[PDB]
Design a binder for this molecule. Structure first.
Ligand SMILES: OC[C@H]1O[C@@H](O[C@H]2[C@H](O)[C@@H](O)[C@@H](O)O[C@@H]2CO)[C@H](O)[C@@H](O)[C@H]1O
Ligand SMILES: OC[C@H]1O[C@@H](O[C@H]2[C@H](O)[C@@H](O)[C@@H](O)O[C@@H]2CO)[C@H](O)[C@@H](O)[C@H]1O
Lengths: 133, 134
């Protein structure tokens, strides 16, 4: 099942998104999106997109239809058939991505944190839990 | 067991997430997490976070000039003798947010300025697996 949930007020510096799940043994890719509205293709403050098929993790944002400059984490801290824990942490400057007891990548903001209205987590992924503190 | 005392790598700013995983010993009385503003003993503390199994409570408070402030108390004791626990302390620009296990537990509004906190301490009757500052 894909996870979609609303953040009607916004994310402030201090919001923490915790995701726990499994990467299916035949996964291609999955994604974590933080969006500015209820429509698919709405602006994306963060697109967190680990591709097991091509062995990269990709970070970017979307404004008015078009992707920004892509950012790529180092190595791939996911593996097929194996469970994971991701923390996405919001600062005043960017997003911290923590995967498996270690920081992984920092993503300078491109969109005001305040314009975020939605968390969606879909793709080739089994979710045990998705929660925002 | 062993205690954790750690200097901070970027102080404590809005977005800092301390995660503590461990277990409460079967003969535990009380343990604590401190966000201290100084290295010496009795120093001011922005956050004192003290699960007490002996008096069935969790206290939250700040210390300034040796003088404890207004104590706050969590809902219940989400801590068990002989059992693992996972605690997150998240610094927002409003307060600190204690998350125990899977749910938010309490929110302590800042009292001391976030600028003063330069040390993390975790000790007492707590067996520690991992202490990470993110
Ligand atoms: O930036 C994230 C989106 O990028 C798209 O893929 C990019 C690809 O990563 C890049 O290296 C280059 O080859 O062009 C592609 C566009 O054709 C994905 O297609 C998209 O879903 C997002 O992941
Ligand atoms: O404020 C936290 C500190 O409380 C001290 O104990 C308090 C106690 O919590 C309160 O119920 C009342 O009885 O006054 C006591 C002071 O004797 C602790 O001694 C200190 O370690 C903190 O946990």
């Amino acid at each position: 099942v894909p996870h979609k949930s609303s953040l009607p007020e916004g994310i402030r510096p201090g919001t923490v998104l915790r995701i726990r799940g499994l990467v299916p043994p035949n996964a291609s890719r999955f994604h974590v999106n933080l969006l500015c509205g209820e429509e698919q293709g709405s602006d994306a403050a963060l697109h967190f997109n680990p591709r097991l098929d091509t062995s990269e993790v990709v970070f970017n944002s979307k404004e008015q239809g078009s992707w920004g400059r892509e950012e790529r984490g180092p190595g791939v801290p996911f593996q097929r058939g194996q469970p994971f824990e991701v923390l996405i942490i919001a600062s005043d400057d960017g997003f911290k991505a923590v995967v498996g007891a270690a920081q992984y990548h920092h993503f300078r903001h491109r969109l005001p944190l305040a314009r975020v209205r939605l968390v969606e987590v879909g793709g080739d992924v089994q979710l045990d839990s998705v929660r925002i503190f």
